């Protein structure tokens, strides 16, 4: 499922970033905070949505 991947992604961003902060890498966090947040953004989401549709074409069409 689409939402399954994205949902896991956001959860992945929080998890990954967590390990970094635990390991001592509070540098990439800004990327995980921006990537994760931007991913949540309804605007950025709608963009990928359309792109996802196109992917369906290339995946369905034969």
């Amino acid at each position: 499922n689409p939402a399954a991947e994205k949902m896991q992604v956001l959860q992945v961003l929080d998890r990954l970033r967590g390990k970094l902060q635990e390991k001592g890498d509070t540098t990439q966090n800004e990327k995980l905070s921006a990537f994760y947040e931007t991913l949540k953004s309804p605007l950025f989401n709608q963009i990928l949505t359309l792109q996802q549709s196109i992917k369906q074409l290339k995946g369905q069409l034969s």
């Binding site: 896991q8 992604v9 992945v12 390990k19 921006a34 963009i47 792109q51």
Partner: protein, 60 residues
């Protein structure tokens, strides 16, 4: 929420996190982001939000 992200920087980041997160499971999650980030379509959309964001904060 408008400090962009830059896939080039975010891509190199996962690369670090990948070698930095040697917990196996973390590599899989890391790779997940890496895949999305490297995705042609995904990369395009992200770029849209990047520049448009910049112009957004700028404004008149």
């Amino acid at each position: 929420a408008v400090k962009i992200l830059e896939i080039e920087d975010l891509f190199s980041s996962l690369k670090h996190i990948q070698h930095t997160l040697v917990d196996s499971q973390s590599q899989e999650d890391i790779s997940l982001l890496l895949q999305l980030v490297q995705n042609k379509d995904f990369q395009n959309a992200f770029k849209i939000h990047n520049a448009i964001t910049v112009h957004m904060n700028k404004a008149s």
